[PDB]
Amino acid sequence: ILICCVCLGDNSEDADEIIQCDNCGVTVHEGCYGVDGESDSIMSSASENSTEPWFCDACKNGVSPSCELCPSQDGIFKETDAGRWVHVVCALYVPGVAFGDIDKLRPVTLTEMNYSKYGAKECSLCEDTRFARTGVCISCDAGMCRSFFHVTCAQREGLLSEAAAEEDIADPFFAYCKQHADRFDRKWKRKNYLALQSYCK
Amino acid sequence: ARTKQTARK
Ligand SMILES: [Ca+2]
Ligand SMILES: [Ca+2]
Ligand SMILES: [Zn+2]
Ligand SMILES: [Zn+2]
Ligand SMILES: [Zn+2]
Ligand SMILES: [Zn+2]
Ligand SMILES: [Zn+2]
């Protein structure tokens, strides 16, 4: 079963397929990575098979990167304008981080304001406490709750949500801590997260 | 891998 490592959804259709990197194995919605609606590759014209190879941006550059915004090494990355790397999901959820091209989600331009938040909050969900003050934490978005976590640490716990397009919320990406989360949403998100972990390995 | 657009209905 294919799960997108950015949004943890499992729907895969001809318009938005969940694809897989043929080197590191990560799986992602075309539309969650800016690789949607692109013509078949030139290597693909050869084969008569129904599929063509695909590689994420980090593998295209021969790196197994770390993220400027969190301590996790898993998931899928985009290059920054300074030659560093960030998770797609970190860039979506961290305030003040935007994509320079929304259609292809590239590149990511991090600012002095982003860097001044490094280590500024302690991640309350880090399993390795040695990294709880690396990177940049987001907070719970319920009321004035001041609970902080890395984006990818919240993702694992099933805490990242995305508003539907019809809801017309300007920033549709939000997170709640466990105290304020939707219990059903957390259930299926952790389930898809765990299936994604078993899938890659 | 990725499914070619030619093979997408
Ligand atoms: Ca952002
Ligand atoms: Ca947000
Ligand atoms: Zn997705
Ligand atoms: Zn890869
Ligand atoms: Zn990250
Ligand atoms: Zn953390
Ligand atoms: Zn909260």
Side-chain angles (χ1 to χ4, degrees), chain A residues 17 20 30 38 40 52, chain B residues 1-6 8:
Chain A
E17 175 175 40
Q20 183 170 36
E30 291 177 315
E38 305 182 345
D40 302 351
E52 77 188 18
Chain B
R2 165 201 184 107
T3 305
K4 293 173 185 170
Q5 239 130 39
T6 62
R8 292 188 188 188

Side-chain angles (χ1 to χ4, degrees), chain A residues 93 122-125 138-151 153-161 174-187 189-190:
Chain A
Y93 280 85
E122 178 176 337
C123 173
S124 62
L125 302 175
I138 59 168
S139 65
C140 177
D141 284 310
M144 305 311 187
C145 183
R146 296 319 273 154
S147 178
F148 311 114
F149 26 67
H150 291 121
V151 174
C153 292
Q155 183 186 42
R156 164 197 101 232
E157 287 303 330
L159 305 181
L160 301 186
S161 315
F174 62 99
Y176 301 136
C177 69
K178 304 184 204 161
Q179 180 179 346
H180 296 127
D182 190 294
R183 216 184 294 268
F184 174 75
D185 286 342
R186 195 176 167 216
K187 283 175 195 180
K189 284 163 187 179
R190 286 172 85 190

Side-chain angles (χ1 to χ4, degrees), chain A residues 66-74 76-77 85-91 94 136 150-152:
Chain A
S66 57
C67 181
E68 294 293 278
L69 301 178
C70 80
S72 168
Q73 310 283 119
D74 327 314
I76 202 172
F77 294 82
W85 300 85
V86 298
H87 290 103
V88 171
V89 67
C90 285
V94 166
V136 175
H150 291 121
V151 174
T152 48

